[PDB]
Each structure stands twice: as C-alpha cells, then as structure tokens.
Design a protein around this ligand. Structure first.
Ligand SMILES: O=C(NC[C@H](O)CN1CCc2cc(OCc3cn[nH]c3)ccc2C1)c1ccnc(NC2CCC2)c1
Ligand SMILES: O=C(NC[C@H](O)CN1CCc2cc(OCc3cn[nH]c3)ccc2C1)c1ccnc(NC2CCC2)c1
Ligand SMILES: CSC[C@H]1O[C@@H](n2cnc3c(N)ncnc32)[C@H](O)[C@@H]1O
Ligand SMILES: CSC[C@H]1O[C@@H](n2cnc3c(N)ncnc32)[C@H](O)[C@@H]1O
Lengths: 309, 303, 322, 322
C-alpha cells in the first residue's frame, strides 16, 4: 500500500477477478463532503474490503460508474466527470498510474466494455452517445448517437471487435456491427415490455445473450431467432447486472436493487439465492481458481464470497 | 452585461468546484443536491434502512451562496411517470425529498426535465409541492427545441428516421411543456430552460416559444463550431436566436465537457459577451420604454 | 369526523334489498366455515364494525337461524348517540349474545379475535367513506384464516356531458373560499339530465383482509374512454361494485345495478372548464387517491383530448378526515 | 407540520446567551446526578429531542468537559433536511458517542431509557410551538427518576393599546377566507409603538415530566388587569419564563428578560373591535388552550369592562397542527 488511500469509499460499484486470482474493486463516494472514487487491487481476495491488506490502491478525481480489466495491467474506468480513464498497473504491481484521462462524453459515462481484441473499448453514457476507443492511440474512432435516452449498459460480443449490444431508457436493445453503414439493429420480444437494465453475452454462442428489465425479469434472446425464447421473474426489483460462470455448461449470476443475488441454469431456474447483502448488489465475478466460488460487492461495503451447488 | 452559469452533473468538492466556475467568469452553477447515481429505496427493507448521511452537508456553503449561486438538478434516476409501480412510488418520494432539500437550502431555482410527452405525475408531485409550505423558489423546466428522438443519427437499419414533411410533429416538445404548465394551472413559479441542439428546427417551431416564460437557454458545447484560430464560435442561425433571446433577457447555461481542448471555458463565455456587446444597440423608443416591459396598468379615466 | 343523525339511520335501515344481500353473505359464509357435524360444538365469533342502530346485528341473528350455526356478536360503533340505541336493544331484546363496544374500530383492543368482520363503510365511490383505512386498522383483530364482508369493492368512472349539472356546480361558489373550490370536490347526485359518453371502466379496487406486507391505500390510475359523438365534457360519474361474499354483491354501476336498491346515488367529479370532444377522439382522465396521517382525498386531471388543470392538489378544496 | 429552512437554523444558532444557559442547565444537572466517586464508572444517557443542526448536542459535549462526567447522546430530529447536517457532523467530528435518530420523538421506539431529555420546543407564548404534546409523547422513554430540560415553562399576558398595531392587523385581510380571520390569530412581533396597560400576569404553566395520571394539556384561565389611565384596548402581548434547570432560566417577560437574548420576540393576541377603558376599571380577559387528536389552538374573550365575541371558536381562523 505505498501511496494509496487511507480509507475505502462506502459504495462498492465494481468487482472483477484477473486470471491470476487477484481482485479489482471500483468504489464511489455517493454521499458526504467528497463525491470521488477509488481503484484497488487485492492479490488476497479474502482480505477485501479491508484497506490495510491490499496489494495496491489509488484515488480518482471522481466516482466510478463502471470498471473493466484490459489484459492483466490495464484498467478501464467510466467516470462521473464524463471522462474515460485507462489506469495501467505497475512493474511490481504496487502502484496504479493514470495512462490517459479523456473528457469526450458531455455527461456521466455510465458503462464501459472491452472488445475481443483488447485494443478497443466502447463507452455508453447519459449524454445518450456511444463511442468506440483506440486504447493504443487514446482517441474516439467513432461516435454514434443511436438512442433517444441515456445509455444504461453496453456489452462487447465475446469474439468480434465489430459487434456489441447496447440497451437504453428509450426501451431499445441494439445489436451493433461497425462493418454496416447503418450499424445498429433494434431487437427483443414481440411486445414493447419494460426498460432494459443489464446485458450478458453468452460465452460460447455470439448466437444468444440475456437482458434484464427494470421489473426484475431476466430474458434469453437468440439474435437470428430474433425472438425472446425464454423468460423468468427472478427479482422483486431492477436487475443491475448479469454474469455467466466460467463453467462448461455455464451458470447465470443475477444482481438486483432488492439486495439479493440469484444463480440460474441454462433454463433460468433458481439454483442459489443469497440475502447476505443489506444494500444494492452492484457487481459479480467468479474465481478462475475455484469455479464454484462467487464474489459479490454491494453499497453495504460487504465483499461476500459464495459456494454454488 | 450577460448573466450566464454552468451546468455540471459531476461535483467532487462543492468548495473547489464553485470556486473554479466563478474564477472562469460564471454567475451561478447548476449541480445535483444528491449524487445523480445514488438511487434511494423508500419502502422495501433492507435498502430502506440505508445508514446516512443521505447527501453532503449544507454547512459547506454560506446562505448567500445557496440563495444566489446554486441551482438544483432533480437526480436523473427519478422517473415519476414510469409504468413500473415500484419505480413510480420511489421517484414520487425521491422528488419531494430532492425539492424539499432545495427549499431547505433556499435555492433561487431548481431544474426538472421534460424529455418525454407524459409528465402527468411529475406535474402533480410539483403542484402538491408548490401548494405545500410557503417559498418562492423558481422551477426551470429543461425542454429541448427538438425531441432527442428526432435528433438521433439515422443508423438504426430496421427503424429509420421518417424523413417525411412533419409540421405538427417537429413542434411536439412545446405540447410537452404546454400540457405540463396547464396541469399546474399556469403557476408563476414554473418557467422554461430551453435546451438548444446542433440542428435548429424550422423558424415555425422557434415561433412557438415566443410569448412563453423563458428564464434560461441551455447551450451545449457540441453546437459550437471552431474558427481559423481555434476560438469556439456559433453558426449565423444560432447567432440570430442568441440576439432574440438577449432581447428577452434570459440567463445562458453552458453544459457538457470542453471540446475546444487547447483553450479554457471563459472562451465559450467570452463569445456570448462578444455577441451581447455587438447587438443592434437600443434605439429612441426602446431606451425610454426600458423597465415598463410587460408591466400592466389599470385603465385610468382622464375625465 | 361527524356522527350520523337518528333520522338518517332510519331511512337507510328501510332498504330491504341491501340487508337481504348482507343476511345471505353471512348465511353462505356460516355454512362454509362450520360443518354440520360441528353445528352445536363450534360457536362463530362475528363482529359488526360500524354497527349503527344494528340492522347488520339483527341480520347476523337472522343468518344464524337460517344456517342453524352458533355465533357470538360484537357491535363496535364510534357514534355514541347510536350506541345509546344499541345498548337499549342489547338490554331489552338481544341479551348477552350481543356485546356492545362504544369505540372506533382502529382504537378498540379486542378481548378475542374474530371469525367474520361485517361492515357497510362503502360510499357512492366505494372507498370515499374510508372503508379501507377503517378495516386496515381493525384487521389485526381478525383471525389468521378469517373472512371480511365485504372482501372486495371496486370504483367505476364514466365521462358525462350535462351543461345542466355544470350550472348546478358553478352556482355552489361561496364567499370566504377559493372561487373555483366548488369544482375541486365530488357531489353525490341522482344524475338525471346528462349524457354518458362511454361505458364505465373500473378506477380503484381494495381487498379485505389486506395480505400485502407494505400496506398502501394511495392509488394512481390512467383511464381512456372512446367517444363516438361530438359533445362537451362537463364531469365524470362515479359508481361501485362490491363482493360482500362469493357471488353475493351490491352494485350501483347502471349495467349491473342491484334491482330496487336506493341506498347509494352516483357521485360526480366535475371539471373547472368544459372540454369540447369530437366523434372518434379519446377522453383520457387520470385519478389519484392520496392521504396524510390526518386526511384522505382524490386529485384528478384530463390529459386528452386537451389537458385540464389538476383538480384538488394537496386536497386544498376537498379532503375526507380520518 | 412544516420543516425549518437551513438559513433559519443558522441565525438562531448565533444567540450565545441562550446556549450558554442550556450548557449550564446540563453542567449543574450532571454534577447532581453522578457523584465524583462515580465520575468514570457512571456514563449518563442524554437525549436532545429536536436536535436541529445540533447546537444543543455540541452544548451537551461542552457540559461533559466542564463537569468531567461521562455521557452518551441521542439526537432525535423530525426534519430530515437537518438530519443530513447531523449525520455529517456525526461522521466527520462527533463519532459513536452521538447516535442520530431521523424520527418524530412521539413515534421513536427508544433502544434504552434516558437520564436527561433536552429540548428547545418553546414558542414566544411558551406552549404555542406544542412543547407539551411532543414531550408528553416522548416521556415514556425517560427514566423513572429522570430530569427534563426544561422542567417548567409559564406563559404571561398583558393588555396593550396600539392603534398602530390595530391597523397592521386589520390590513392582514386576504381574499378567500373569513374577512375577520386576521383578528382570530396570534402574531409574533417586535412590539414598539404600544402602551402596556397593566403588569403581565401568568396565563398557562406546564411541568416535565408530567406525573398526573390523567394527563390533560387543555386549559382555561380568567385574568383581571387593573388599568390606571383612560385608553383603548387593541390586543394582549404574550411572553414566557422557563425553568431549564434549578435557578437557570430563559425569559422574554420585560421585567425578568434574559439580557441580550434575541431568539424570541413577543406574541400578540388582537381583538376585532377596540374596547374603550377608563381610569380605575378592570380589563378581564379569558384564555382557553384547546385540542383535537389533530390540532391545538387558543380561543380568547374580553368580559370586562365590556364583553368581546369569543375569538377563534373551533380553531376556525388559527390552529397549530400536531
Ligand atoms: O348516496 C347518498 N349518500 C352517500 C352515502 O355514501 C350513501 N350511504 C348509503 C348507505 C348508508 C347507510 C347508513 O347507515 C345505515 C344504518 C345503520 N344503522 N342504521 C342505519 C347511513 C348512511 C348511508 C349513506 C344518498 C344521499 C341521499 N339520499 C340517497 N338516497 C335515498 C334518499 C331516499 C333515496 C342517497
Ligand atoms: O420570535 C420569533 N419567532 C417565533 C419562534 O417561536 C422563535 N423561535 C426562537 C428559537 C428558535 C430556534 C430554532 O432553532 C435553533 C437551532 C437548532 N439547530 N440549529 C438552530 C429555530 C427557530 C426558532 C424560532 C422570531 C422571528 C423572527 N425573528 C426573531 N428574532 C431574531 C431575528 C433577528 C432577531 C424572532
Ligand atoms: C352505516 S354507515 C357506517 C356506520 O359505521 C360507523 N363507523 C364509521 N367509521 C367507523 C370507525 N372507524 N369505527 C367505528 N364505527 C365506524 C358509522 O358511525 C356508522 O354508524
Ligand atoms: C430548534 S426548533 C425545534 C427543533 O426540534 C424539531 N422538532 C420539533 N418538534 C419535534 C418532534 N415532535 N419530534 C422531533 N423533532 C421535533 C424541529 O424540527 C426543530 O429542529
């Protein structure tokens, strides 16, 4: 902890495992004198949230909306400031140094995703804009105003730098393909339905993905079927995140503002349910080291670990 | 000679932030009273019993500063007209919470969005708030010249932007406002903060907002073209409007990040000060009539 | 907030169809709760909440003779003037079978819990006489497996045209209040010279007992009315249906109106300014039920084909006192 | 029924004499409750009821350092806007010693019972800001042997002549209410151009805690004022004295007025018609404190030398909302 911050902000926003087994935390201050945020690496994941037993930490100008790993050293940050930040991890993995901080969005940057290559990222915001980045060149390649409302979630396809989903408050789920002169394509169920709030690409088929609506319903979409194959009422409230397990036949981890975690099979049926959190469940990553151990962070400052049957 | 403030949806330290924008040459700051991403639950445990503080302290600024320099913004997550029962009730509570806190601080004005057509429940909450307690805060309704839907790039392959002649279509943001203020029986504490896009509409739309109560005009950084040197400036069509707004004596609100990276923010502002001090100077009639603007006088019998 | 006059009770006691229906709602509930094998072993504890001068008490005693099932009666009444009349019947006629309780049901601490709670708190618009708030406060003394009579009621609205009734309201202006106040309140009225512009759609519904863990009796309801002539909107007629028990019901909804029942006239929510409406257009009305700890009130507005001003914001013109 | 604005709190925080007096009232109460032999063993549980932005909390912490006695603090506040300010002080500065409670004291279910309850609910007429009703509801969580600060307060009335203030009131007529309403309510006012016609006599008194088994905060009080000039009665000036603790007191009664304390101005109960009064005659005024479950109000009347009409019957013109 050379440098680092003395204290960790109350509101844990993001939580991502490396391939090593290390744990990255995004934290924002959503109340009090100072409305900032902070990045933390934890080579010991059972130590977190504890600030004393961390491998490295750092303080950001402003709170962190979304996070993501970029290889093993790169960390991509969606700031409230309207900026995208790339923080490169140190030589000995003791510091976290700002590589670039670009002010391109006119409002809160609400979501980031890295594309298959790991050379490019797409940022969604409250300005309604979506942007594609070169993380090498540190610039906006493309800037698409597809939506008519603030962008909730953007999710890069597993295997194509060309393709990614975005979902917005305008009720639109878009399927992108930067190779078309009209990239975006509106998709979803037969009916209008409630607003989309969360997007998880399936790991094996770019064919299929799941989206969560604000009425606590998770749905499974096949892109060419172009119809909502399956659905289930999983949560009492807004679904804020969906994360597939690294398993062969992969499980679906389901976050909500009802402070609960759900884990569902390929048919969206309740396997596990945890009420261990007493405030909004914000993020989830599964251990690559132990595929049956699952880590969640809340606004209740709890870093919880679950064993999953 | 020009009154103008700065919209931010990000404030880490209200002390330094307000200090900066004043040093940039602004008159006031539009900012959140609660953190925009800090959703609150009001009914369902456990989220209900979230420990405080619920926002930053009122001690950080003086009364004089709260009364003059700060303009509240309703947190963007507050959607009182949601078709979801739970989100509706939470936004009902959230809005009173946000508006009440603005009254407590004694803010001169508070910003609310009109970004969809049905604001029947947003109007009712506000109407109950205006008739509940006694205060003379102002309510700036954020309405765009052109709906966000009719400003979007034509890049959705299977739902294109219908290019056809639409007279009553491209006025629709005015019916948004007219419906809203009508529900609020034309309250004097409800006025317009008119948001301007890169693409202006046809004059016939800019002719609607004639006669309406415009206290503010929101210029995003986007719409500013650059010139030979690097100075940010405006189109001759955006200038024609600025000159008409200046006549109405409205405050100007710069919103969004710096896109003229090489120069500071007092450059955007400088240009407005430039436009202002160049406008067709006031003639004979307009110099004697200064002050009597829209002042009613009862009929006096001269006999 | 006010007690009913003796002669008021008198008239409403004389609607036999209403008390036939209440008698039967119990008759059918008795048989379903105590088997014939238990008809002398099991005595049912039965509470008339808002007993009045006790036509519901008498009716409960008629239901017992009909079903030949055993019952014990509490008669809880807030109006002490009425309680005089109960305690006099209790002594002269009923006897120990009927306990009398001079109390508000929201307050009363019950000696035992009840099988069946029986009340007639319904207004012309169902929940306007505050049936929800009264039974909400008095349900914690209902048995875990206990019945409410009524179990369900629903309010119904329909847009109406009557330049006649528009005058009648306009002339209700009084000195020493908002000069438009007369428009921001509902009037009970035997509608006669008027024009129903659309089929009544339902507005608000309530269930008893109320299972939901976070009880909330506030409502918001958007209604859309197809209109198939040119006309001028002057107001909205209000009616209700109620499920006393199973298929037994009272209704003042003209379509399903319980025959020969005069107990309730329709309500009327007027609007300040009459709204012109043309063949084919949709009238869209919005209704809120609102409440403090102290008072309950409706606010309302027209959003199509033109917007009205929101009527009775803050319950400024009209509130019903808890 | 309404929350105080930040800048309102600000000004009233700047009366040092008032908070000097509250600091001392605790200082003296601490020493009398925990012997020196117990100064480290006994920790006193101390509750600021209506904590505001916490000048009474700070003052309680200053009292502890002064007496070197151990204390634990609850800060109960109804106004959530203020609670924001408390919870921010609680975090930054005070810490675990100060619990914060965002609740009405009448509602709050206390985790433990209190040694000392400390409140500044007093109005210009003492009980007009409903100090009695608030502390009555919140006393069941005071220890059997516990102190209230304040323990005692008393309202004082004196007849006044001011044709100037009579105009100021008459001109408070507003459209859309009883055209005499402006006379049937009390005005807080820095009395200046007026004539005190008699020495202030006491009107109403309250004690905390309230031992009496049948608590009742309604009052009726006949006052007789010797008048030793010819003059015209226009109203009655209201003041108060309060016993915070022992000999420590606040007062706005001009005779015993706490020096340099601007927190409270006098009240004024006007009368519709000015009453002529002659040298030697007695002004006899009558004052009632009245209340529902919902609202509290004063009614009043002049019975000598001529009768007035009873002012504010039913609290029609003026009520303070519980
Ligand atoms: O609709 C009206 N008022 C609104 C109110 O909600 C309706 N309810 C009805 C039930 C009821 C029952 C009571 O108690 C019974 C009772 C207990 N014990 N003893 C008697 C008391 C009042 C009401 C009013 C109303 C007003 C004037 N006339 C008529 N119609 C009749 C006049 C001759 C045709 C109706
Ligand atoms: O008499 C008045 N109002 C009637 C009311 O009963 C009097 N009380 C006094 C105590 C108090 C204490 C509060 O809280 C403190 C506090 C907690 N935390 N932080 C601060 C709040 C209000 C009042 C009003 C009144 C009105 C206008 N001006 C003046 N005088 C000053 C103006 C500059 C001379 C007096
Ligand atoms: C027949 S009209 C309803 C009857 O029930 C009584 N009532 C209404 N509300 C209540 C209540 N909350 N508690 C007890 N009785 C009530 C009324 O005084 C009337 O006699
Ligand atoms: C200093 S004025 C009295 C303070 O106590 C608060 N207060 C008044 N009445 C109550 C009550 N019944 N419960 C809790 N706080 C109260 C007020 O909001 C104010 O901050």
């Amino acid at each position: 902890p050379p440098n680092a911050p003395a204290c960790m902000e109350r509101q844990l926003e993001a939580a991502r495992y490396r391939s090593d087994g290390a744990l990255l935390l995004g934290a924002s201050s959503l109340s009090g004198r100072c409305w900032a945020g902070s990045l933390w690496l934890f080579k010991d994941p059972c130590a977190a949230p504890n600030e004393g037993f961390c491998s490295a930490g750092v303080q950001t100008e402003a709170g962190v909306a979304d996070l993501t790993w970029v290889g093993e050293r790169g960390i991509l940050v969606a700031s409230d400031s309207g900026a995208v930040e790339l923080w490169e991890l140190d030589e000995n993995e003791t510091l976290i140094v700002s590589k670039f901080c670009k002010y391109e969005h006119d409002d809160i940057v609400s979501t980031v995703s890295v594309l298959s290559s790991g050379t490019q990222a797409v940022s969604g915001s409250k300005d309604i804009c979506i942007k594609v980045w070169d993380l090498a060149q540190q610039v906006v390649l493309s800037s698409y105003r597809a939506h008519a409302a603030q962008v909730t979630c953007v999710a890069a396809s597993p295997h194509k730098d060309s393709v990614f989903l975005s979902c917005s408050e305008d009720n639109r789920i878009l399927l992108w393909d930067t190779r078309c002169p009209k990239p975006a394509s509106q998709i979803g169920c037969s009916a209008p339905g409630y607003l989309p709030t969360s997007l998880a690409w399936h790991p094996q088929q770019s064919e299929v993905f799941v989206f969560g609506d604000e009425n606590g319903t998770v749905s499974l979409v096949d892109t060419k079927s172009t119809s909502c194959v399956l659905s289930s009422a999983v949560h009492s409230q807004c679904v804020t995140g969906l994360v597939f397990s690294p398993h062969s036949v992969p499980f679906l981890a389901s976050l909500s503002e009802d402070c609960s975690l759900a884990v569902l099979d390929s048919s969206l049926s309740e396997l596990f349910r945890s009420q261990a959190h007493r405030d909004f469940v914000r993020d989830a990553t599964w251990s690559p080291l132990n595929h049956s151990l699952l880590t969640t962070v809340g606004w209740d400052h709890q870093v919880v670990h679950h064993v999953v049957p | 000679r020009v009154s103008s403030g700065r919209d931010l949806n990000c404030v880490p330290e209200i002390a330094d932030t307000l200090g900066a924008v004043a040093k940039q040459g602004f008159d006031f700051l539009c900012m959140p009273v609660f953190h925009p991403r800090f959703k609150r639950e009001f009914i369902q445990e456990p989220a209900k019993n979230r420990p405080g503080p619920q926002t930053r302290s009122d001690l950080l600024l003086s009364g004089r500063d709260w009364n003059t320099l700060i303009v509240g913004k309703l947190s963007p997550w507050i959607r009182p007209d949601s078709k979801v029962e739970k989100i509706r009730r939470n936004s009902e509570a959230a809005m009173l919470q946000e508006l009440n806190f603005g009254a407590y601080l004694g803010l001169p004005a508070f910003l609310l969005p009109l970004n969809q057509e049905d604001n029947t429940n947003l109007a009712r909450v506000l109407t109950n708030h205006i008739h509940t307690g006694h205060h003379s805060s102002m309510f700036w309704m954020r309405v765009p010249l052109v709906a966000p839907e009719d400003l979007r790039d034509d890049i959705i392959e299977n739902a294109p932007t219908t290019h056809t002649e639409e007279y009553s279509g491209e006025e629709k943001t005015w019916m948004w406002w007219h419906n809203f203020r009508t529900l609020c029986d034309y309250s004097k504490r409800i006025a317009v903060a008119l948001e301007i896009g890169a693409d202006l509409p046809s004059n016939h739309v800019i002719d609607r907002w004639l006669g309406e109560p415009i206290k503010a005009a929101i210029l995003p950084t986007s719409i500013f073209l650059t010139n030979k040197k690097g100075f940010p400036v405006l189109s001759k069509m955006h200038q024609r409007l600025i000159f008409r707004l200046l006549k109405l004596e409205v405050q100007f609100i710069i919103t969004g990040t710096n896109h003229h990276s090489e120069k500071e923010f007092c450059s955007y502002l400088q240009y407005l000060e430039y436009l202002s001090q160049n406008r067709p100077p006031p003639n004979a009639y307009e110099l004697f009539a200064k002050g009597y603007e829209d002042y009613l006088q009862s009929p006096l019998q001269p006999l | 907030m006010d007690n009913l006059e003796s002669q008021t009770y008198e008239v409403f006691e004389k609607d036999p169809i209403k008390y036939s229906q209440y008698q039967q709602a119990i008759y059918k509930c008795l048989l379903d709760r105590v088997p014939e094998e238990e008809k002398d072993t099991n005595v049912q504890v039965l509470m008339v909440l808002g007993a009045g001068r006790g036509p519901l008490v008498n009716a409960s005693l008629r239901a017992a003779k009909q079903a030949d099932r055993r019952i014990k009666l509490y008669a809880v009444e807030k109006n002490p003037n009425a309680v005089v009349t109960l305690e006099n019947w209790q002594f002269e006629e009923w006897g120990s079978q009927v306990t009398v309780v001079s109390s508000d049901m929201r307050e009363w601490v019950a000696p035992e819990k009840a099988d069946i709670i029986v009340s007639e708190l319904l207004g012309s618009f169902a929940d306007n006489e505050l049936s929800p708030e009264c039974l909400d406060g008095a349900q914690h003394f209902l048995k875990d497996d206990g019945v409410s009579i009524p179990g369900e009621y629903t309010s119904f609205l329909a847009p109406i045209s009557s330049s006649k009734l528009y005058n009648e309201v306009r002339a209700c202006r009084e000195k020493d209040r908002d000069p438009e106040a007369q428009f921001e309140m509902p009037y009970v009225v035997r509608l006669h010279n008027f024009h129903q512009l659309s089929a009544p759609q339902p507005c608000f519904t309530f269930s008893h007992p109320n299972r939901d863990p976070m009880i909330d009796n506030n409502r918001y309801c958007t209604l859309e009315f197809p209109v198939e002539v040119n006309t001028v909107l002057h107001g909205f007629a209000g009616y209700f249906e109620t499920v006393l028990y199973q298929d037994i019901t009272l209704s003042i909804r003209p379509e399903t109106h319980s025959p020969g029942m005069f107990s309730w006239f329709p309500i009327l929510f007027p609007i300040k300014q009459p709204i012109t409406v043309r063949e084919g257009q949709t009238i869209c009305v919005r209704f809120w039920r609102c409440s403090n700890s102290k008072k309950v009130w409706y606010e309302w507005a027209v959003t199509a084909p033109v917007c009205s001003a929101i009527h009775n914001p803050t319950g400024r013109s009209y509130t019903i006192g808890l």
